[PDB]
């Protein structure tokens, strides 16, 4: 079904680790980035799959 | 974090600013030095981190010169006024040398660079430029020597800013190019704080923001190695990469390369 | 709060009167954006107003939103103001009496900050940088040990009542010593320089209910603040309520005097940064302090578990039970990681970033497990028999902004308890109407 | 000792703190050691450290030490003496030593050459130069047992006697009772009753410089003792084994686990010693190689201990080789030595030195102590942060990522609990689309992948869903070689799954990428094997769990062998481009349809 695809992706995507994670991405990044190294710094820390 | 090093190299060479006072103009050394202290003063408001240095060349060597106004300015000015006078009252011309030894005041700068790199904190970069106000004309004698200079400053990535006064210097255009620096020709000496201002007070981030004048006509005339003068057309050795002026049926340096 | 929000809520007036010391000039130029510092030497020289399409063309089309910013902040600070140039055009200029005086403060002109130093010669007692330093931390420590309610540490009686109205303590029964709440401890848990420039604000925010000028005492702030370390100043010169605010400085560690009555003071390490190592941190949740005072071993035990106490190092390890103590407390994951990364040693700033991402993640982690669930007390409305009906109702209590969940598949709506009243009576009308 | 803040502070202690903190080293009272790494004499008080103690722990910045009996004992079997020991634990201390430390470390180094036990003629014998110490354990009732008939006073020369050869685990056990601990050293240099072979490895198997720190330390003083020596799977292991055997120049006995380790030491003796296959025997009922008068020879457990009727030709085997001495007999994966008929087999075969090689010397029911003493000391313990910062071993970087529990499996598994949710979280929906994902990810990007997974009934959907190799385990013996000889030399395909396998020393070729699931409960072993079949970014390994489930417990309680090591895990909670592309159970009406056939088990 059309709506089943949406609603496992609604309930899976989001289900625990995202509900208070997004609201904090949402209340939050209202400032500039302090320095570019901190991206070069997760970058490096980040796995391959989290870099596309 | 941001630490940003400006090292500023004074042209005091005594014939062109004698004869600059000769003239009577608007402009005079006093001014000048007056200027640098005033753009000193304002990198220093910049930041609280932000560090000075202040090299004066000569046809004698370089000189390190480094009430109601800030105290650490306060004595950061008197010194360079103290400097700049003993350099200048001690300055007597013994020899047929006249040409500026701006190549000895960037090596010196160099290591003087490298050496507060190492006392920086892991945690900060210490970004550094060198500003260069040029009065004299340029010397070609010491083109190889430069050269080693403005290498050496692209590997550290130390940024050039050249400030010609009266007569441009291509070694400047050059080490500008190179070294990502700016290259401006004052229009009008008594304006030049407001140019110092204006161009060279920002730093390179900010300069991505900031509009600036375009690059002027850099050239890449070589120096002949028998003659230490520029050209634009010559031999050049297929093994050492010398350069010479005229063709030879031997190369003088792989003559000497045995 | 930083200092360009307190300074961007004050009138008009009192940024006029603070610009009129060339010390206050310095610093609120220093608190200015880089693009904004570029602007502010440009100008200095300028005595005649730009247009505001001419200062928008020096920075390019991306970068638009810094300079707009930038520009906001400028006009909110009152550095610059908008002059009707002839033509219909608008000017932008300095302020001349700002501009005047951060030349004084740059160029020179005037006389100096301080009256004068060497008429009473050399100091007689004088100390030395290690001695004041040390001065200054003792005192820090007896602050913060009487936020705690020790013994050993006695203060003034208005050093508590500041604290009270600060909101670190409250005093429920007189005469028995304040608790200190959650936000004492927060408070506590923040670093130093930000601990200082906190109370300070509230010494300001409630300046004005002793009487005291906060222009002079601003003034005269940041004249300590850009003052040189181990040099004295003259005490002359001053009006007496600022004084007496100096004499509290004496209290907080912040300006050195041995006597009252003494003509000289010398600011302190702690005095110069109040106008803005020794952890190391382990991958297996361990803690190695380079410390041996009470306080950085008390902050640390708040949210970990000691171990070991040499007469030189501590180690402790940071546990899921400890952080849960610790926020259970009031304090933050975010309070915790910042207070890490100040205190961390310099070995861990080769480490980009200096603390191991995994620590962190950790204890942000173990931060969310606090507030899994979320309770609303609300009452609940299930008895719609029509749509149109339940999405009147619906409509109703969201013009009252009294809904806090709301299901239109299955007509399922939850108010507030106190919004359960004026849907009651709503829905009672409406019936009525009917 | 007090408990203001719950820690055992000791600042009264140790307070000698002169000038000022030149000695990067911290002592404790009862026994430990802190090192600090960022210290210009590291290197210099890592090579001390290491010859008296053995590690508890290694991360980037603090070292962290245990002193112990055995370490003490390891320490003065080499040259150091005492006084060199106690003077430079002293130099180094920056606090000053405590006065319960020097007391243990003399109570220790006393008691170490007093005794030793020496095998001759086949006959074990144990000597002493003192004579007082044959009374004093002479009272000893266990000892008593040992003799037989009684070994009047064995008057040589020095007063020894002879022991019950099946009997000598208990005698060894009673000694350190006793605080009179026994020694295993074999002086090789000067034997003439032993027919030393002519083994010579080829001056062209160059060793790292971190196995001639565990060789060296192995030969003190020109003898061999017995010892225990860690080295990561992907690091060189069997070399160091193959060159204490050419070093000791004896006959030279291999015990390995599985039926294909004896192929692999093979292997190895034919690379790396230059000995001729008619000396080489391997004695595992297989091909028979006449191991009948042999040099060295090669078999595993299991079949040294039966404790049923043993083929004819077998028992011909064991009867010639119980009947002659052995030189540094060698064990393979000593990890799992104390068991109950592997220890046994330590009896049931007479050698002069025991010599036992691991990766992953953690082990639970805490018989690793049992070790100590079984076969000898914690003799090295490689720093494997050091290993891989030199890059012959691959820096993994290890991963944690867990997946939330889907409502549909949620329910039944907080409904169960009779032993019936192990395949619940196993089959977790959210669980397979990651595997899944990283199977991708890694595929579209060419890395190799070995998916460890316990449970076979689970990995049977497993596997059969995105129609991938597996081993089941008991499939036979060629189709597993075949199957793990194409997954290195296949570009199309370069991903298998293991049940349970690959929990041991095999020859499984170079892997980048390891994603486990659903392994065993608390085995901090079998993680610590599995990771070492990656390493050899190079490359990373993930392990997948379910929230709210007991796999979180058990991957916590897992990883803290990992951590001592110096790895750190990483949590991932999200996975970017989940939705990017379409993954198997995608909809609701699978995941649901899922529920039937994991609950269709009903072994009842
Ligand atoms: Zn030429
Ligand atoms: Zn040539």
Redesign the interface.
């Known amino acids: 079904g059309t709506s089943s695809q949406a609603e496992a992706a609604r309930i899976l995507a989001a289900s625990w680790p995202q509900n208070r994670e997004d609201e904090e991405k949402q209340k939050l990044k209202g400032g500039p980035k302090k320095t570019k190294r901190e991206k070069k710094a997760a970058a490096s820390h980040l796995f391959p799959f989290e870099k596309l | 974090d941001e630490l940003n090093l400006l090292v500023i190299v004074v042209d005091a060479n005594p014939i062109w600013w004698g004869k600059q006072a000769l003239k009577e103009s608007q402009f005079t050394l006093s001014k000048c030095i007056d200027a640098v202290m005033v753009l000193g003063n304002s990198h220093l408001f910049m930041n609280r981190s932000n560090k000075l240095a202040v090299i004066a060349s000569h046809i004698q060597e370089s000189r390190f010169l480094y009430d109601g106004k800030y105290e650490l300015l306060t004595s950061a000015n008197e010194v360079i006024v103290e400097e700049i006078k003993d350099l200048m009252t001690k300055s007597d011309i013994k020899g047929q040398h006249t040409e500026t030894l701006l190549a000895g005041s960037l090596a010196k700068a160099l290591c003087y660079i490298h050496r507060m790199n190492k006392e920086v904190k892991d945690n900060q970069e210490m970004k550094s430029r060198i500003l260069v106000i040029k009065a004299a004309e340029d010397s070609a004698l010491q083109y190889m020597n430069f050269m080693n200079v403005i290498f050496a400053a692209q590997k550290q990535n130390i940024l050039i800013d050249a400030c010609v006064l009266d007569s441009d210097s291509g070694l400047l255009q050059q080490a500008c190019d190179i070294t990502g620096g700016l290259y401006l020709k004052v229009p009008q000496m008594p304006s030049l704080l407001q140019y110092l201002l204006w161009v060279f007070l920002p730093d390179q981030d900010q300069r991505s923001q900031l509009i600036l004048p375009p690059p002027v006509h850099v050239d890449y005339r070589a120096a002949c190695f028998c003659h230490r003068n520029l050209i634009e057309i010559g031999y050049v050795c297929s093994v050492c990469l010398s350069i010479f002026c005229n063709f030879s049926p031997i190369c003088t340096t792989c003559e000497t390369a045995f | 709060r930083n200092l360009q929000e307190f300074l961007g809520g004050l009138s008009p007036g009192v940024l006029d009167r603070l610009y009129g010391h060339?010390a206050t000039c310095?610093a609120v130029?220093?608190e200015l954006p880089?693009?904004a510092?570029?602007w502010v030497?440009?100008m200095?020289?300028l005595e005649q107003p730009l247009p505001q399409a001419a200062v928008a063309?020096?920075?390019?089309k991306e970068?638009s939103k810094?300079?707009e910013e930038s520009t906001g902040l400028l006009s909110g600070l009152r550095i610059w103001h908008t002059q009707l140039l002839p033509g219909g055009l608008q000017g932008l200029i300095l302020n001349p009496i700002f501009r005047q005086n951060l030349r004084?403060?740059?160029?020179?002109?005037?006389?100096?900050?301080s009256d004068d130093t060497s008429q009473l010669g050399p100091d007689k007692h004088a100390r030395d940088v290690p001695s004041l330093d040390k001065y200054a931390e003792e005192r820090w420590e007896v602050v913060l040990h009487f936020m705690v309610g020790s013994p050993s540490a006695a203060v003034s009686q208005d050093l508590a009542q500041l604290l009270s109205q600060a909101g670190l303590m409250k005093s429920t029964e007189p005469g028995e010593p304040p608790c200190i709440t959650s936000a004492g401890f927060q408070f506590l848990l923040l670093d130093t320089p930000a601990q200082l420039w906190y109370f300070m604000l509230q010494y300001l925010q409630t300046a004005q209910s002793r009487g005291m000028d906060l222009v002079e005492i601003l003034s005269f702030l940041f004249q300590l603040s850009?003052?040189?370390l181990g040099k004295d100043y003259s005490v002359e010169g001053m009006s007496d309520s600022l004084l007496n605010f100096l004499q509290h400085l004496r209290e907080f560690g912040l300006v050195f005097q041995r006597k009252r009555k003494s003509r000289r003071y010398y600011p302190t390490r702690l005095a110069i940064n109040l106008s803005?190592g020794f952890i190391?941190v382990?991958?297996?949740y361990?803690l190695?302090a380079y410390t041996e005072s009470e306080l950085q071993?008390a902050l640390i035990?708040l949210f970990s578990?000691?171990?070991?106490?040499?007469?030189?190092?501590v180690?402790?390890q940071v546990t899921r039970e400890s952080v849960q103590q610790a926020i259970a407390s009031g304090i933050t994951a975010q309070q915790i990681i910042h207070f890490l990364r100040t205190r961390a040693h310099?070995?861990?700033?080769?480490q980009?970033?200096?603390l191991?991402?995994?620590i962190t993640?950790?204890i942000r982690?173990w931060e969310?497990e606090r507030?899994?669930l979320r309770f609303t007390e609300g009452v609940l409305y299930n008895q719609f028999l029509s749509q149109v009906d339940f999405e009147l109702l619906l409509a109703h209590a969201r013009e009252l902004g009294v809904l806090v969940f709301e299901n239109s598949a299955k007509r399922l709506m939850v108010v507030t308890p106190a919004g359960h009243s004026d849907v009651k009576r709503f829905w009672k009308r409406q019936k009525h109407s009917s | 000792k007090v408990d203001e803040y719950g820690a055992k502070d000791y600042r009264l202690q140790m307070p000698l703190k002169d000038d000022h903190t030149s000695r990067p080293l911290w002592v404790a009272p009862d026994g430990h050691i802190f090192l600090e790494a960022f210290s210009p004499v590291y290197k210099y008080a890592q090579d001390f450290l290491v010859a008296i103690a053995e590690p508890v722990c290694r991360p980037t910045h603090v070292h962290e030490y245990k002193l112990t009996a055995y370490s003490l004992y390891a320490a003065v079997s080499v040259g150091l003496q005492t006084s060199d020991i106690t003077e430079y634990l002293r130099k180094l201390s920056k606090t000053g030593v405590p006065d319960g430390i020097m007391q243990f470390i003399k109570l220790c180094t006393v008691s170490y050459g007093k005794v030793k036990l020496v095998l001759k003629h086949n006959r074990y014998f144990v000597e002493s130069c003192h004579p007082d110490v044959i009374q004093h354990l002479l009272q000893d009732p266990v000892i008593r047992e040992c003799r037989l008939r009684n070994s009047e006073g064995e008057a040589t020369e020095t007063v020894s006697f002879e022991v019950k050869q099946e009997m000598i685990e208990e005698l060894q056990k009673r000694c350190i009772h006793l605080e009179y601990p026994l020694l295993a050293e074999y002086d090789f240099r000067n034997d003439s009753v032993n027919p030393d072979i002519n083994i010579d490895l080829k001056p062209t198997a160059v060793l790292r410089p971190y196995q001639e720190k565990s060789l060296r330390k192995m030969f003190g003083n020109g003898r061999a003792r017995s010892g225990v020596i860690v080295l990561p799977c992907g690091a060189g292991k069997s070399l160091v084994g193959v060159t204490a055997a050419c070093t000791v120049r004896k006959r030279c006995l291999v015990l390995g686990n599985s039926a294909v380790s004896v192929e692999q030491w093979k292997a190895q003796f034919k690379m790396w010693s230059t000995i001729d296959d008619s000396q080489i025997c391997r004695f595992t009922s297989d091909a028979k190689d006449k191991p009948i008068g042999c040099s060295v020879a090669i078999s595993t457990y299991s079949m040294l201990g039966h404790t049923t009727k043993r083929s004819w030709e077998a028992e011909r085997v064991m009867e010639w080789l119980k009947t002659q001495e052995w030189g540094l007999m060698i064990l393979d994966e000593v990890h799992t030595i104390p068991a109950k008929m592997f220890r046994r087999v330590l009896t049931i075969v007479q050698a002069h030195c025991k010599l036992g090689l691991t990766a992953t010397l953690v082990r639970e029911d805490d018989k690793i102590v049992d070790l100590n003493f079984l076969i000898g000391p914690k003799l090295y313990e490689a720093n494997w942060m050091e290993l891989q910062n030199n890059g012959y071993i691959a820096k993994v970087q290890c991963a944690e990522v867990w997946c939330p529990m889907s409502p549909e499996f949620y329910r039944e598994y907080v409904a169960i609990k009779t032993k019936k949710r192990i395949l619940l979280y196993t089959m977790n929906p959210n669980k397979f689309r990651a595997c899944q994902f990283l199977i991708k990810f890694h595929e579209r990007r060419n890395d190799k992948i070995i998916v460890f997974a316990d449970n076979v009934f689970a990995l049977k959907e497993y596997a059969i869903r995105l129609n991938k190799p597996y081993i089941y385990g008991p499939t036979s013996q060629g189709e597993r070689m075949q199957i793990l000889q194409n997954f290195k030399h296949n570009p199309k395909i370069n991903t298998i799954f293991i049940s349970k396998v690959g929990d041991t020393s095999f020859d499984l070729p170079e892997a980048n990428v390891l994603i486990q699931i659903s392994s065993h409960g608390g085995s901090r072993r079998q993680e610590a094997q599995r990771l070492g079949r990656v390493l050899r970014y190079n490359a990373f390994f993930y392990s997948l769990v379910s929230q709210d489930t007991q796999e979180m417990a058990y991957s916590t309680k897992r990883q803290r062998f990992l951590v001592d090591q110096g790895y750190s895990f990483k949590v991932i909670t999200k996975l970017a481009g989940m939705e990017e592309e379409d993954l198997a159970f995608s909809t609701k009406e699978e995941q649901q349809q899922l529920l039937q056939k994991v609950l269709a088990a009903t072994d009842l």
């Open positions: 060339p310095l130029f220093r880089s693009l510092k570029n030497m440009r200095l020289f063309l020096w920075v390019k970068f810094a300079q004084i403060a740059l160029l020179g002109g005037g006389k100096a900050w850009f003052s040189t803005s190391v382990e991958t297996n361990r190695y071993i035990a578990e000691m171990l070991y106490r040499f007469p030189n190092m180690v402790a310099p070995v861990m700033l080769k980009t970033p200096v191991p991402p995994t993640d950790q982690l969310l507030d899994r």
